[PDB]
């Protein structure tokens, strides 16, 4: 709680959330778990969500979440990017070719959206 008021806003910045899923992957087999549809762990969604839902802003305080997400093999539809995807209001994806075309920033005008 702010001194005589509700808490100041929250500035949150995360780098490479995908690395979390990769770290889980590193051992997922060693837990004796069978592989999921791909080498990923079948638990994937649960540990993703428990992470994601700890980021919402409440009546008390507001949290501004910024997440850079690595894309494996530029496959937007790998399980991890797709599954992550449904937890954001603003979508921002970069296109390798456009950067190869020299433009900065290389933000796709098409895919990137915002619920606002």
């Amino acid at each position: 709680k702010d001194e005589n008021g509700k808490g100041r806003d929250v500035l949150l910045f995360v780098d490479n959330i995908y690395r979390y899923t990769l770290a889980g992957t590193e051992v997922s087999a060693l837990l004796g778990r069978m592989p999921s549809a791909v080498g990923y762990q079948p638990t994937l969604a649960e540990e993703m969500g428990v992470l994601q839902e700890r980021i919402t802003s409440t009546k008390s305080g507001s949290i501004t979440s910024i997440q850079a997400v690595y894309v494996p093999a530029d496959d937007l539809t790998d399980p991890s990017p797709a599954t992550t995807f449904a937890h954001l209001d603003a979508t921002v994806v970069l296109s390798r070719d456009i950067a190869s075309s020299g433009i900065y920033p290389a933000i796709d005008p098409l895919d990137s959206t915002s619920r606002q």
Partner: protein, 69 residues
Amino acid sequence: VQPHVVTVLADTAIRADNLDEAAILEARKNAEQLLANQKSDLDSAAALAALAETAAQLETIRKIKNRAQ
């Protein structure tokens, strides 16, 4: 005419005996007409069609290039 060369600049002439041979000039006329029909009947039919189907459905391929699943 010259004392050694004579010629006619023909508005329209045909090696013929009489205007009855008009039944003959129209033969080449409609022949070239048929050819004029043919050039279109192939050109659009060959070019426009095949080239139309070429680029048609290519997109769904170019979008699924790096598919791992």
